[PDB]
Symmetry: C3
């Protein structure tokens, strides 16, 4: 057996098809069995329409064996493009073995595994091209987001979106997201899913800032400040060039969005800014984007 | 020597350039020496224009050594995008070693080898991403078709189209077709070529049905039924959702076309249909698409 | 450590980021430390705008450690898309180990390495798909060119353009150029850079000929002959189909441009032509495209 063939076969049992059907729409993606009690992680855009119209759509899981099982949405996060599904009382589940995406290195050989029984599913091979790479993700009603992705030259497409990005120990180091390829790191998936399973929601910090990238005074230039926002109270203004959020240098508006989310909610943080040519440090206390889930 | 370098060099002698030239057009593709008597398999779209205008076009083979030889069309099949050429009385031919595409597995490392002396030929590397994958192929006068392809993330382009998809034992498991990459499986190539060499034609079954895909009652929905067709006599109607042809579940119009061709010609077969919401099984006897070659 | 991970880490110290910033523009690419005295080779389009507007742009190198250093343009060649930069009095430089691109073979495994600290840098993996492959390159004020590239199915993009194409001995066999992927061979880079370091310019031969490709009397068909050119004095005319320049058969206008540059400047050379259907050989003495640098 080939060296990638063994790795793809060993994890095929842990990968499932995810299907959302209505009266005149049937939607598919891949997923990953992360808990033996029937918890399956996919990405939020695979199930986005069903979660936004739950009265008309129906979600099912098709396992490697062909077994079709009803599935229920535990929670979802458009901001990380993640989601958790639950299948109830399904036995002998092969739980995916989850790696540590902080031990992933550029050049590591990876497989982007799709649902073994999906309609036009794919299994692609490549290497890790970039780590901690901010990428904007576009969906339906949800709003666009940015994530620190693992980048890979393994192709990420409709046929493996939501499936796992696998290392050569058959461990999950990421969740593929097709909507030059990108994966959500597994350590971020572990956090987001640990809170979607418990709370059915994840709470991210906000500052009320919309930026545009600038490079010449490079960084994320403030396009608008929400009234009453933590940036209102911190003293951040328009035309400001944000160059550091917390302990993270901000290269552009993509790294800004990701640097805000690595801040502590409700805890003072420094924001370094170049204003009219003058280096100004500012203090901000991030709000929870969901006040009543916090 | 590298592990892919050895494999690509060992099969370079079995790959040829195929050139079709006229007064104001010169066309190229790759090909594969499959028989020591001078039989060369390419795909039908490489030679499509020359076969449709044989009075104005001229086809030649350029071997790995540089030898140019005249070539004559034995037969071709737009339905599988395959074709056979013949070079006469050329000695010391290195015949490609042909594999068994039913022993191919997802994750298998492959090379998509192009003509070693072609104009802008390529040799690409990847894995098998999907097996038994129906793909529509678009040509000139010929009509579009669908095939169960091997899917690969090795790039399939103009520079290796018609060349072999090679496994790590230097065996041909497929024929590359550029007109995310797809190859005709070798076991299907062996069948189609075994009949093009003998008969100069291949005969495929037909039912007289044109479908469109539906997914919500998913399958291939009948758009039109030819009068007097086997579907006329079987009782298949319009707005019917074909969900199984023979022993093969039909996911969409792509899998329909491929499932019809795996039927026995002139032998009763069951067609399962969802009509106005009612599961109706129907019997059909497939016609030969070429009555006087059958 | 993975087999590509070790190779990418071992050369990460020899790869740098190259940044050209002005008042309202900031430009990035990758580069390669080729000499311990501070010589860095990139491709010409990374620095094209800064070299054409040196009063407004500022170029810097960011090393693997994070050290930012000012950089000065030693020379550049839009015709090979190459360029040399110099950092002065920077110590403990890890000099890239340079391979021999004439010992590169189709199927060789390669890494297209980008700047380890670049904005959206990539490291991609693949094989050598084609050797001695003429490719047109498009820039700003510079004029388009054609080069004998190494072709690779490793992705060549903005994030590794200007960085090295690396073999499995961690040796540079090419310079990546994003503006299916292509690299300038290292042996051609060695020549062009050896003359840009000494002379701050490279001198290429010219004949005063503009061609268009023809294939039916295939080759490079003469579209225009410059008055007083070496082609004026050699007797080359319009509508001529150039089929060989020197010791190199010319398949099209791409191979023509590359075959002219492999001629000796100021030394008689044969040009084989098909004129009105008649094979005519002609003699030409190539001019230096830069008379006062020659």
């Amino acid at each position: 057996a080939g060296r990638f063939t063994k790795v793809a076969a060993a994890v095929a049992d842990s990968v499932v098809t995810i299907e959302s059907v209505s009266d005149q729409e049937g939607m598919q993606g891949s997923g990953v069995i992360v808990d033996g009690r029937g918890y399956i992680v996919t990405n939020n855009h695979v199930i986005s329409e069903a979660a936004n119209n739950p009265s008309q759509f129906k979600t099912t899981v098709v396992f490697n064996d062909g077994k079709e099982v009803p599935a229920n949405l535990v929670g979802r996060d458009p901001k990380t493009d993640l989601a958790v599904l639950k299948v109830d009382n399904v036995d002998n589940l092969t739980v995916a073995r989850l790696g540590d995406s902080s031990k992933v290195r550029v050049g590591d050989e990876v497989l982007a595994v799709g649902a073994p029984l999906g309609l036009r599913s794919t299994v692609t091979q490549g290497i890790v091209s970039a780590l901690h790479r901010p990428v904007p993700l576009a969906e339906g009603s949800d709003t666009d987001t940015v994530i620190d992705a693992i980048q890979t030259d393994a192709s990420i497409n409709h046929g493996n979106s939501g499936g796992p990005l696998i290392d050569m120990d058959a461990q999950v180091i990421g969740i593929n997201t097709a909507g030059l390829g990108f994966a959500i790191p597994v350590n971020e998936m572990k956090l987001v899913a640990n809170s979607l399973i418990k709370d059915g929601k994840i709470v991210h910090p906000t500052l009320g800032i919309s930026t545009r990238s600038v490079s010449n005074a490079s960084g994320a230039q403030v396009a608008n400040v929400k009234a009453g926002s933590p940036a209102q109270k911190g003293g951040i203004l328009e035309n400001d060039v944000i160059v550091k959020v917390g302990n993270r240098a901000v290269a552009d508006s993509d790294e800004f969005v990701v640097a805000v989310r690595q801040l502590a909610i409700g805890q003072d943080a420094p924001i370094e800014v170049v204003r009219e040519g003058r280096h100004v440090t500012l203090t901000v206390k991030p709000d929870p984007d969901s006040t009543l889930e916090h």
